[PDB]
Design a protein around this ligand. Structure first.
Ligand SMILES: CNS(=O)(=O)c1cc(N2CCOc3ccc(C(=O)NC4CCN(C)CC4)cc32)cnc1OC
Length: 859
């Protein structure tokens, strides 16, 4: 089939890894995942191509609703009919549903075109002009992001009446073409020899190994004897662990750490004891070690792919039985765990359990209580499942068998509890499966909010075919926006050798279930290719020639045939709803930063004002910390809007796309507090006192009565950023990374340093809040009010921040690698305290930042 071979080269191109590389591994796990996932994904591709037209809209154009709408006023809208210049502007209510708007559009059409139309309002969908956005469903118009956004900017919604027939034309054009428990002996292994080893000649090499279940030690850590340093060290010694073979859990991992002493770590390596087919491993294995920066229980259970350089470690997994031993089936595990003894205790110990389970480290006598009252947990306190799972002796199969009996009979938990079970603290595969079962309830909007964390959990996975992968693939194929971001979250880390096989495999499976989207993602990947080359010309040229000259040699290069085709007509990788239509070459430029970031301007004739967008292409810098912080800010925005608090936040797009490569979304009509404070002459803001510049600037951008709105936009946005930077630890705040929109909105940029590494408020910010006045405690205290209100809202969702940041440890961020970094967040959200005790601390911290604010005023 010539059809398949072209698809095959395109997939290889898109994932920046040849599909021949996978078949060159000779690996059956890789081949079984490929075959099984292609099956699963083509079944999804088939389901989708036969979806209803409204159902196909829900896949392609999932609704962008306001946080308040999820789970009154007079409005003016302009409606057109697909394939016509003629448009109708009309009045509607913010309480009207799209069906009433479509009935208005058809009634106007009927009188204008002089026809008693057969055309039903139910037969249409409202597209947002020049955007991959639709308004459908029975929701009042204000509930839609585009409408609600339009009201705030004072713009007119621009819609196109799209008939069910053209939506089916879209679907059709986009279709895919045609026994262990009987082996009492302790755990032992023969450490044979090392290969391609590097260490100082003075030193004497030792191998240390431990048996783990995620983090927790199954038994005491055991080290080996000292060997003289050479390229090929030779041990041939037996390490006997304090654990019977029957007591080994399913998810047991044997972890190694090679370190030279007279003290320095050289390399580390891990392997699962049971294979993907649940059989206990025996024989000789070649552990291609990763460079060490004291075992690494978290690191990949897959060897270093660069088999040349890597310092290998030859081991012998000894034969435990003269027959192959597999891990007992769930039906076997449940038999052993069913027959248990129930905990009967007095009213006194009943108080102790309710006290401790609600109150998360414990004491060894209390762990014995929680285990004895484990039936009471399932019944009275199900959400305490995590505590109980932690007090389970995972190195003893009888206890583990008793736990899975309660787990398989456990009620489904809320999404907060399930997200907590995704952590590496709960490495059991049935616990992983239970957590996912309790997450199936996630809305596509919620899933999209936690997608980044779920992607990091993929790195904690021990085997390729897992329930999390199956889930994120099925949700991606059921939603084109989830599909888009899942693709990019994976594609961006393809340069990392530990994840390039897993991520490359997930992308291939996705591509098999979405042939059309692949071609849409290839077009994006082709634009990004050209931007790297164009950035490289800029980087070189900016050194030799002045900025106006480089700017024009870039503009010349952009005008080239291949660049014009490449950079035009594409879905924005920062937003699939945003179409990057016509590149405005003359308006493109670059920054005077070390990486010479490129500013790419775009416009749409069909979208009008909505099409005038820009992207920033940054190569040389790692954007993963900006994307986290912004996603965390966006969360706060959603959390606040849900309590009816709109703090006019600007959580702009930021997306890593490759190795120190990514895009950031341009927020137009905005300057830096720095550029404004320059206080340049002949400018409208030219201030007598520097404190005035910022307000003179707002006065200049918002004439007359509008300034009062611009001050409120600034006050609210200012309050939300004071909290965001406190709670999050956003340090290194200068005048050049605090920006202001012409609307009055304040926002922060350049989040390379968070979590410590209180609030930063100068008197010109206080001056704007105070409306120029010196003494204005009425206005200043509303700002403190908004700050406290916003902070109390976040604390209530403190655990959601805690659990998200926890799963984000897997991401390999240097400022987010251990529990000492989640510490800042527990301190800032004051979670081990009652709301008043927490408010008292916030008040003190606010006053302490306010006393630090009056240092500026002293002058
Ligand atoms: C620091 N420059 S960057 O890499 O382009 C970058 C940009 C942004 N955002 C994205 C949101 O929308 C924006 C709008 C404006 C700006 C900006 O820096 N304009 C200044 C204003 C004063 N002029 C004299 C020079 C240009 C930046 C952003 C964020 N992060 C970045 O890096 C980490």
């Amino acid at each position: 089939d010539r059809v398949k071979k072209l698809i095959n080269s395109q997939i290889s191109l898109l994932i920046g890894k040849g599909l021949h590389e996978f078949d060159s591994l000779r690996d059956p796990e890789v081949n079984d995942f490929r075959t099984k996932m292609r099956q699963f994904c083509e079944e999804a591709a088939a389901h989708r191509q036969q979806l209803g037209w409204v159902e196909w809209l829900q896949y392609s154009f999932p609704l962008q609703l306001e946080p308040s709408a999820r789970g009154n006023r007079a409005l003016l809208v302009n409606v057109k009919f697909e394939g016509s210049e003629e448009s109708f502007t009309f009045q509607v209510s913010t309480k009207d549903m799209p069906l009433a708007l479509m009935a208005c559009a058809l009634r106007k059409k009927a009188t204008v075109f002089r026809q008693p139309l057969v055309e039903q309002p139910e037969e249409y969908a409202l597209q947002v002009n020049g955007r991959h956005e639709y308004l459908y469903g029975n929701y009042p118009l204000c509930h839609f992001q585009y409408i609600c956004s339009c009201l705030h900017s004072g713009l007119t919604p621009h819609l196109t009446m799209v008939h069910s027939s053209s939506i089916l034309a879209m679907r059709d054009e986009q279709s895919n073409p045609a026994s262990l428990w009987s082996l009492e002996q302790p755990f032992s292994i023969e450490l044979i020899e090392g290969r391609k080893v590097n260490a100082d000649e003075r030193m004497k090499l030792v191998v240390q190994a431990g048996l783990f279940h995620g983090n927790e030690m199954l038994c005491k850590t055991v080290s080996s004897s000292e060997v003289n340093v050479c390229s090929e060290p030779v041990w041939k010694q037996r390490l006997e662990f304090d654990i019977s073979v029957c007591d080994l859990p399913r998810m047991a991992r044997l972890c190694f750490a090679l370190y030279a002493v007279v003290d320095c770590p050289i390399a580390w390596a891990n392997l699962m004891l049971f294979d993907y087919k649940d059989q206990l491993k025996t024989g000789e294995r070649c552990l291609y070690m990763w460079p060490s920066v004291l075992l690494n229980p978290a690191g990949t259970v897959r060897g270093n792919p660069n088999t040349e350089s890597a310092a290998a470690l030859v081991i012998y997994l000894p034969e435990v039985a003269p027959h192959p031993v597999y891990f007992p089936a769930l039906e076997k595990i449940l038999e052993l765990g069913r027959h248990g003894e129930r905990g009967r205790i007095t009213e006194e110990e009943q108080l102790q359990l309710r006290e401790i389970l609600e109150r998360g480290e414990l004491y060894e006598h209390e762990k014995d209580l929680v285990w004895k009252m484990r039936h009471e947990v399932q019944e009275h306190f199900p959400e305490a499942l995590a505590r109980l799972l932690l007090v389970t002796k995972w190195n003893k199969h009888e206890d583990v068998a008793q736990m899975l009996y309660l787990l398989c009979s456990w009620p489904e938990l809320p999404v907060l509890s399930a997200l907590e079970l995704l952590d590496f603290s709960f490495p059991d595969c049935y616990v992983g499966s239970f957590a996912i079962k309790s997450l199936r309830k996630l809305t596509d909007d919620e899933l999209f909010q936690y997608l980044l964390q779920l992607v990091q959990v993929l790195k904690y996975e021990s085997y390729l075919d897992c329930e999390l992968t199956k889930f994120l693939l099925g949700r991606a194929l059921a939603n084109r926006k989830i599909g888009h971001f899942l693709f990019w979250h994976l594609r961006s880390e393809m340069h990392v050798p530990s994840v390039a096989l897993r991520f490359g495999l997930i992308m291939e499976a996705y591509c098999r279930g979405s042939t059309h989207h692949m071609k849409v993602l290839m077009k994006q990947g082709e634009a990004l290719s050209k931007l790297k080359a164009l950035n490289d010309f800029v980087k070189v040229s900016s050194q030799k020639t002045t900025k106006p000259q480089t700017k024009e040699m870039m503009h010349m290069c952009m005008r080239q045939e291949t660049y014009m085709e490449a950079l035009s007509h594409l879905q924005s990788p920062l937003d699939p709803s945003t179409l990057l239509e016509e590149v405005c070459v003359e308006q493109c430029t670059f920054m005077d930063s070390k990486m010479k970031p490129l500013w790419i301007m775009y416009s749409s004739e069909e979208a009008g004002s909505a099409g005038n967008v820009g992207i920033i292409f940054k190569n040389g810098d790692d954007l993963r910390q900006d994307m986290l912080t912004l996603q965390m800010i966006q969360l706060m925005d959603v959390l606040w809007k849900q309590e009816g608090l709109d703090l006019r936040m600007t959580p702009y797009g930021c997306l890593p796309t490759g190795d120190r490569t990514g895009l950031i979304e341009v927020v137009l009509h905005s300057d830096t507090i720095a550029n404004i404070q320059l206080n340049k002459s002949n400018m409208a803001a030219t201030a007598a006192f520097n404190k005035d510049a910022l307000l003179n600037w707002l006065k200049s951008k918002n004439p007359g009565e509008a300034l009062d709105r611009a001050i409120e936009e600034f006050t609210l946005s200012c309050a939300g950023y004071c909290v965001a930077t406190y709670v999050l630890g956003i340090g290194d705040r200068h005048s050049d990374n605090i920006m202001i929109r012409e609307s009055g909105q304040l926002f922060h940029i350049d989040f390379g340093h968070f979590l410590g590494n209180p609030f930063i408020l100068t008197y010109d910010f206080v001056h704007v809040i105070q409306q120029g006045k010196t003494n204005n405690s009425e206005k200043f205290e509303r700002f403190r009010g908004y700050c406290e209100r916003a902070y109390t809202i976040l604390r209530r969702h403190g655990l959601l921040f805690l659990h998200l940041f926890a799963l984000m440890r897997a991401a390999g961020l240097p400022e987010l690698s251990c529990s000492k970094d989640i510490q800042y967040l527990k301190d800032s959200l004051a979670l081990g305290k009652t709301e008043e005790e927490a408010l008292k601390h916030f008040r003190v911290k606010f006053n302490e930042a306010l006393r630090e604010s009056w240092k500026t005023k002293v002058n």
